[PDB]
């Protein structure tokens, strides 16, 4: 039936512009207004505007009047939305859809940043020390100062999954991301099993396996 195809993710610098596409199928494109919506992490959706593909006529939310420009390409049954003079506030997931419909694009994620591609530094979150307080120990890896998202983390080449918690990344004031991945294991296992986090940052094609061990005053 009705299908609306958007792009995936796009990184753009402040001051620049981006042109998002929405390829329609399953219906007569020129028939049916195409609407655009913006969604920021836990910020409530916002209606940007709509376009009549047949006439090219448009209507905008006054809030986006000076930032968004809707157009269409009849030959390719594709609707476009150009966002200008980008700022951090324009970072969001954008959708094409209809007035109140079940037909939505999968959403395109725009990230506005001046940061440059950078692989992460991986630091150990060493299992406590001395003796255990509950027979259970916690250890992990602090994957920080990387850009852009995402990074993936596995443990022991996938051999360890139970008790693993890889947290959502956070954007630091520096403009770089950081996230931690932890796992709880028996304290009694620290001396018989090796724990290694496998970190992959595809945007920089960087990968690194970091062994996490208890901290020892004797070692350098």
């Amino acid at each position: 039936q009705v299908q609306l195809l958007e792009s995936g993710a796009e990184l753009v610098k402040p001051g620049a512009s981006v042109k998002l596409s929405c390829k329609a199928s399953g219906y007569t494109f020129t028939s049916y207004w195409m609407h655009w919506v913006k969604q920021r992490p836990g910020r409530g959706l916002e209606w940007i505007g709509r376009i009549d593909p047949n006439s090219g006529g448009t209507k905008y939310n006054e809030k986006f009047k000076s930032k968004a420009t809707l157009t269409v390409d009849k030959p390719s049954s594709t609707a476009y939305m150009q966002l200008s003079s980008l700022t951090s506030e324009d970072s969001a997931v954008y959708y094409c859809t209809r007035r109140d419909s079940d037909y939505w694009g999968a959403g395109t994620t725009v990230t506005v940043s001046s940061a440059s591609t950078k692989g992460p530094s991986v630091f150990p979150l060493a299992p406590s020390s001395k003796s255990t307080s509950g027979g259970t120990a916690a250890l992990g890896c602090l994957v920080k100062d990387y850009f852009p998202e995402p990074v993936t983390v596995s443990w022991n080449s996938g051999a360890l999954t139970s008790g693993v918690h890889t947290f959502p990344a956070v954007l630091q004031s520096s403009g770089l991301y950081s996230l931690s991945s932890v796992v709880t294991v028996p304290s009694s296992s620290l001396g018989t099993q090796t724990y290694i986090c496998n970190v992959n940052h595809k945007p920089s094609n960087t990968k690194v396996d970091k062994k996490v061990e208890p901290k020892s005053c004797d070692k350098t």
Partner: protein, 213 residues
């Protein structure tokens, strides 16, 4: 700018129970109201339109009501697949506007967090920065308070936290809090502590370490 005020922002329920979500309009919107369901990483799906007309394919457990300014989305016999975000929308007038959303989570017995504190690695200190991490593991409900203290002085504004989604198997949450200090600041002080408060803790739990080695 017809505001649709949606409540509650978050709510917990059990399978088989009923859920009620409210949206109030700043102007009369007749019955031109729609409700949508949205799960992480996915686009919204239409549930109700015209305030009470259930969209095709939607379970009869979903019902919408209201006329004028107050609208309600009711979910009966709650099912695990209903755990998601829900939001309203008015299309009586342009610009179209949406409610702020409501996240529906699953309830379970209270579980106190297991807390762990991690000092910065010597490897990182060579960078001039010191990240101290506090882990709150497998707890419920989601609400938790982490207070960082250095030499017993309360820290403010220098920590960032992250929380996982409800665990598929035990329905708990876990959170990580990272305290960012300059190497100089870290080297100047001695006692580092993470104080945790939570419904499941009779008294606050503080994990701490002294810088040394």
């Amino acid at each position: 700018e017809l505001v649709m005020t949606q409540t509650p922002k978050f709510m917990s329920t059990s399978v088989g129970d009923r859920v009620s979500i409210t949206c109030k309009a700043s102007q009369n919107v007749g019955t031109a109201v729609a409700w949508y369901q949205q799960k992480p990483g996915q686009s919204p799906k239409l549930l109700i339109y015209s305030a009470s007309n259930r969209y095709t394919g939607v379970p009869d457990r979903f019902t919408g009501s209201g006329s004028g300014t107050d609208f309600t989305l009711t979910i009966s016999n709650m099912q695990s697949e209903d755990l998601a975000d829900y939001f309203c929308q008015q299309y009586s007038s342009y610009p179209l506007t949406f409610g702020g959303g409501t996240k529906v989570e699953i309830k379970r017995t209270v579980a106190a967090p297991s807390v762990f504190i991690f000092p910065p690695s010597d490897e990182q200190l060579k960078s001039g920065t010191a990240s101290v991490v506090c882990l709150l593991n497998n707890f419920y409900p989601r609400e938790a308070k982490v207070q960082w203290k250095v030499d017993n002085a309360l820290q403010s504004g220098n920590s960032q936290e992250s929380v996982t989604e409800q665990d598929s198997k035990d329905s708990t949450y876990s959170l990580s809090s990272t305290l960012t200090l300059s190497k100089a600041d870290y080297e100047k002080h001695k006692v580092y502590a993470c104080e945790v408060t939570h419904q499941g803790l009779s008294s606050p739990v503080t994990k701490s370490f002294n810088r040394g080695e």
